[PDB]
Design an enzyme around this catalytic site. Sequence first.
Site, short mmCIF file in Angstrom:
data_model
loop_
_atom_site.label_atom_id
_atom_site.label_comp_id
_atom_site.label_asym_id
_atom_site.label_seq_id
_atom_site.Cartn_x
_atom_site.Cartn_y
_atom_site.Cartn_z
N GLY A 11 -6.29 -74.72 69.01
CA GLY A 11 -5.97 -76.12 68.83
C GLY A 11 -6.25 -76.88 70.10
O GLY A 11 -6.47 -76.30 71.16
N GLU A 12 -6.24 -78.21 69.98
CA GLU A 12 -6.48 -79.11 71.10
C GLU A 12 -5.65 -80.36 70.81
O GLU A 12 -5.30 -80.63 69.66
CB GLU A 12 -7.95 -79.48 71.17
CG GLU A 12 -8.35 -80.27 72.41
CD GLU A 12 -9.78 -80.77 72.33
OE1 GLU A 12 -10.64 -80.04 71.82
OE2 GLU A 12 -10.04 -81.90 72.79
N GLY A 13 -5.34 -81.12 71.86
CA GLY A 13 -4.56 -82.33 71.68
C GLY A 13 -3.88 -82.83 72.94
O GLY A 13 -4.39 -82.65 74.05
N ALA A 14 -2.71 -83.45 72.76
CA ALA A 14 -1.93 -83.99 73.87
C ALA A 14 -1.59 -82.93 74.91
O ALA A 14 -1.69 -83.18 76.12
CB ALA A 14 -0.65 -84.64 73.33
N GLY A 15 -5.46 -80.56 78.64
CA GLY A 15 -6.22 -79.41 78.19
C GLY A 15 -5.97 -78.98 76.75
O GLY A 15 -5.24 -79.64 76.01
N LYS A 16 -6.57 -77.85 76.37
CA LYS A 16 -6.45 -77.29 75.02
C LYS A 16 -6.01 -75.82 75.01
O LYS A 16 -5.74 -75.23 76.06
CB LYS A 16 -7.79 -77.44 74.28
CG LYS A 16 -9.02 -77.06 75.11
CD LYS A 16 -10.34 -77.41 74.42
CE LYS A 16 -11.54 -77.24 75.35
NZ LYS A 16 -12.84 -77.50 74.66
N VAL A 17 -5.96 -75.23 73.81
CA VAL A 17 -5.53 -73.84 73.60
C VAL A 17 -6.55 -72.95 72.91
O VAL A 17 -7.16 -73.34 71.92
CB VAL A 17 -4.27 -73.79 72.74
CG1 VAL A 17 -3.74 -72.36 72.68
CG2 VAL A 17 -3.23 -74.74 73.29
N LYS A 33 -3.71 -71.38 77.39
CA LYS A 33 -3.59 -72.82 77.43
C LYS A 33 -3.99 -73.22 78.84
O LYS A 33 -3.41 -72.75 79.83
CB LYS A 33 -2.15 -73.25 77.11
CG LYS A 33 -1.93 -74.76 77.12
CD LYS A 33 -1.08 -75.23 75.95
CE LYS A 33 0.31 -74.65 75.99
NZ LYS A 33 1.20 -75.24 74.97
N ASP A 119 8.64 -82.42 69.65
CA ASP A 119 7.57 -82.54 68.67
C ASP A 119 7.56 -81.31 67.76
O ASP A 119 6.54 -80.68 67.54
CB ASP A 119 6.22 -82.73 69.39
CG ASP A 119 5.09 -83.19 68.44
OD1 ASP A 119 5.30 -84.11 67.61
OD2 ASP A 119 3.98 -82.64 68.53
#
Length: 261
Positions: A11-14, A15-17, A33, A119
């Site tokens: 996944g990516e979003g609010a 670097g990425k994983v 991450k 979240d």
Amino acid sequence: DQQYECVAEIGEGAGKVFKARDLKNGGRFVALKRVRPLSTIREVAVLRHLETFEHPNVVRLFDVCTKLTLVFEHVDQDLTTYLDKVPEPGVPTETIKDMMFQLLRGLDFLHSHRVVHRDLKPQNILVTSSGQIKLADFGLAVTLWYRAPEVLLQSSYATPVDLWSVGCIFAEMFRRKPLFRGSSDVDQLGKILDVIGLPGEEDWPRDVALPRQAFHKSAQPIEKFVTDIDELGKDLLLKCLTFNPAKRISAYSALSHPYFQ
Ligand SMILES: CC(C)c1n[nH]c(Cl)c1-c1ccnc(Nc2ccc(N3CCNCC3)cn2)n1
């Protein structure tokens, strides 16, 4: 580092994983991450610290590489995928009860240590090959369907925020589809109050851009939107979805509710 090999992008979003191979440890899958101050130093400190307790219901933190690389244990799937692939007519009443408890334990564990996920949602609640719940993606500073009323109103961000999300997820276990699926904070708050109905005037936070008058709604029967739930699950779920965070049940109080007896 030279000890991990990225095979895919989780996944990516609010670097990425990423999904990677732990070359030094039998080529097991791990979750890398790559994040990108003192606050960060401190959040990492908190994570290292919580890790030491190795709570069964949170993802193990295998390593931190000195922008910043965190290595966590990998889980094949998340709660969404699990609900997507679950055969009709849904999730075993008892599988729900079990996952929810495991969900509340990991949550109470964080709350006891004063960490607020903020979240929480099916996408970051990982279900392990053995049916175990493990929370991920927290402790490090798109979908409002799980946001709590106060967050939307922008007044308080205490730990009650996560119990609201929990109830939102508790319902979805049965529904298998999001409960409050809004498209904006206002729309979102709108769909919520459509179901739980307007709260007392004194339950409305003071000094927030949105006034209670901004909405017009009565308490609808909950079993209407959540079919199969029992009397006990109904009570609990409501105790989670209380408009006033000060009245909302705590993960700790939750762990004792009759529903889990
Ligand atoms: C919640 C995710 C985005 C996460 N954030 N930070 C870390 Cl750390 C993790 C993490 C840790 C361990 N295991 C997995 N596992 C996983 C989760 C989702 C998916 N997917 C892939 C298929 N579509 C749905 C999403 C694959 N693996 N993730």
